[PDB]
Symmetry: C2
Subunit: 477 residues, 2 copies
């Protein structure tokens, strides 16, 4: 029997759809964070591949009993850890079609729709975000669909690297400096390592509570002037709208004005919070992006396409091409492989296309709004409880709070750590933490697609029930 037999495809396909619909219907029964022990799976599974085939009915049962227990349910309506793994039916069907077609977007000829639909949706999504025409295909720029924002940052950093090193000489790679906040995600540092940036030439600029931990352009100018006086070349600054720890925001406009002075490439990283700027009341968070060179968000984080789909807009696609193309430098229809790392591109445009058509701009705006409203509600319940405290301002549907004690910081930090792990150990909910400004913080990030208001309130009661429990027996130890 052919491994791609259409009728067996139809038969087994309907089974997995029923399996997944059953999973989504029952997901609340599982503990959110997996409770298996390290190595549990290597001991339950054999050590060699089977010589003979096994039935899909046998495999699906093993999925139920061996795999699902070792899952941490990001799709659970009770998952508030990290950032969301934002899914939808439309996104799933897009990946299903892409997987089903299984074409390789090596070039435009390899599937013209896989190349052209991407250029259309990137313009669709850009215009929703009110990106200037310098980022669009209608105007002077272009957009590309990539897997992760780390890869997105790697390419732009390489493009900026090649732009500078092609002018002053390749031998000066050891002087290029990469600038970010001490809240910037580690994807920036990782790209700098791969791109050949010297490890001691990475800058994690200090941020202050006075600015709610957003990078101050004046502090950046000071660091640049020191680097310049030390014989170093400033290369690349990456302000973040929505840092992963306390959802801090960097002021884009003054940062690019500082970067214009010193001929620096600016990448605006809006990996999580970027999708909300289709709502006009949030679009101010990326004001100044008109002056930046590149812009990226993770659609798989907050825009209902399944993992993974990172959307990257650039003003000058040529810069990416010159750095990433393998055709000779005297050579450098869109060929998206020259815009990214992967040569065998996936048909990621279907995901974004399906999410846009099946919901429309209006519903998508309301989806993000409901997560924020739910987080504003969670913020309100916390403020009304004198035992809790909001640590930093809430900006996009994430709330950072801590339980107060009845230094004082080291105690409050130890209290919130023991508090959080007790809560997470129940399996009822799942939050992660962050240490910002020396303060341990619990993070409440409302983005799971199945999450509704009942789950948020359910989590709040579990927080205060454990608050009553732990604050009752304190003993300062």
């Amino acid at each position: 029997t052919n491994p791609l037999d259409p009728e067996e495809f139809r038969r087994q396909g309907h089974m997995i759809i029923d399996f997944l619909a059953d999973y989504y219907r029952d997901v609340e029964k599982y503990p959110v964070r997996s409770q298996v022990e390290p190595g549990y799976l290597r001991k339950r599974l054999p050590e060699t591949a089977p010589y003979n085939p096994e039935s899909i009915e046998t495999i699906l049962q093993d999925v139920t009993t061996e795999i699902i227990p070792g899952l941490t349910h990001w799709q659970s309506p009770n998952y508030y850890a990290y950032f969301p793994s934002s899914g939808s039916v439309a996104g799933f069907l897009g990946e299903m079609l892409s997987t089903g077609f299984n074409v390789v977007g090596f070039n435009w000829m390899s599937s013209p729709a896989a190349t052209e639909l991407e250029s259309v949706v990137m313009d669709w999504f850009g215009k929703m975000l009110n990106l200037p025409e310098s980022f669009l295909f209608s105007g002077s720029g272009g957009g590309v669909l990539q897997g992760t924002s780390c890869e997105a940052i790697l390419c732009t950093l390489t493009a900026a690297r090649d732009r500078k090193l092609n002018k002053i000489g390749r031998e000066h790679i050891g002087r290029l400096v990469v600038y970010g906040s001490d809240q910037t995600h580690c994807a920036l540092q990782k790209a700098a390592q791969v791109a050949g940036i010297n490890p001691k030439n990475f800058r994690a600029i200090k941020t202050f509570k006075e600015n709610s931990f957003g990078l101050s352009a004046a502090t950046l100018r000071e660091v640049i002037l020191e680097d310049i006086e030390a014989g170093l070349i400033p290369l690349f600054v990456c302000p973040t709208v929505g840092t992963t720890s306390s959802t801090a925001v960097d002021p884009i406009s003054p940062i690019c004005e500082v970067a214009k002075e010193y001929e620096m490439w600016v990448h605006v990283d809006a990996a999580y919070a970027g999708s909300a700027c289709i709502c006009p009341e949030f679009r101010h968070f990326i004001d100044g992006v008109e002056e930046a060179d590149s812009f990226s968000l993770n659609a798989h984080k907050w825009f209902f396409t399944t993992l993974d789909c990172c959307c990257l807009w650039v003003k000058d696609p040529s810069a990416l091409v010159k750095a990433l193309s393998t055709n000779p430098e005297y050579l450098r229809v869109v060929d998206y492989k020259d815009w990214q790392i992967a040569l065998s591109r996936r048909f990621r445009s279907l995901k974004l296309w399906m999410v846009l058509r099946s919901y429309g701009v209006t519903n998508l705006r309301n989806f993000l709004r409901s997560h924020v409203k739910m987080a504003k509600t969670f913020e309100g319940l916390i403020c009304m409880d004198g035992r809790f405290e909001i640590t930093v301002p809430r900006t996009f549907a994430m709330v950072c709070f801590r339980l107060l004690p009845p230094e004082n910081l080291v105690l409050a930090n130890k209290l919130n750590q023991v508090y959080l792990e007790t809560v997470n150990a129940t399996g009822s909910v799942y939050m992660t933490h962050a240490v910002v400004g020396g303060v341990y913080m619990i993070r409440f990030a409302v983005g799971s697609t199945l999450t509704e208001e009942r789950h948020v309130i359910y989590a709040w009661k579990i927080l205060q029930e454990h608050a009553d429990l732990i604050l009752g027996k304190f003993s300062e130890a």
Copy 2:
């Protein structure tokens, strides 16, 4: 209505399944290479995203009318271009379970099964390939699943680069020399560009017809000594099993002996042909891999997993972690994010698990064997038509041939280009070409899962008919 509503998921889920099963049933009717013009899709689609939702029925109709015509059908049984984009029902289900769970393999804790199932199947697959225990988790090595061949080589090269530069100082990056043959895939040169290697320290070493265009270790030693006396530092060599142009084979064992003399990192690229070494009769093609540092293949090319799943085995995961992790260098349960450039991992091991379980070792060996034997038949048909010529030795399921014309090398090349383009313009079959040793040759790569012997024989008839009409009214001018 929740965008992940379980029942709406089920209804639309079964819908797309029928659409895709219908697709596989009818894919022979379409022309293999797409026939649209560049820009066709921008014209037919609106320039803005809709404000209001659209039906899944309307969308799916647009997929039939707007997207399918702009597809080059990699899954068509009459597709023979490039390398196969192999899939199977089992692989499709694994990616749907992956997309269904929609978890992020950031940690072991983020989904334990997503980390452990990978370590198991990588050992399964490694043992099926009879890799030494120095590559397996059972022994002293380890295995990671990545997207593309180029990211695998990228992590491979930065780990090599960091291992050398941490011993001699970061200041010598501009002396590191990366070695490949003039047949090596463009992924090595691209990885070398991103990793900060100087563009003029990339070596595409010349291959000769007398070696069927496999890299001679003697030639490699000659080039290295040239590099050493130019003040350069040899770092990294990438012998290839099954090159993309003519499926030449580089002899691993002599190349590594050259590399241990100069303490170079050896990466064996088996992107396409590595799958076939699970059959004992092909395992000799990767002999000497025991003396190399890393080894990679694309399961999406020739192992029935869906696009994309690249298998990387390294001897010392420490090298990857120290180069790719973002925690400070003194600190530098498996955390696979440190094994690749991507941070938000996908649960790719389900694809590989499904294929290994649903078909098992015996069936898989014979799947690969059927493609090779089908190719061997095509070669046999070519050799009994005196108007054609086999250009290079067939090693893995791909035949290179050319029409002979009844100085002349230039004439022959333009003949075969015209011949090939008339054949591809029929829409009945699709093949691409290569120029190797100055000889334009056509490539017949038999690997599409739906391909059966009738399709190959059909493709032979069309080649013969077009050979009849081109050679009938043929004049030199």
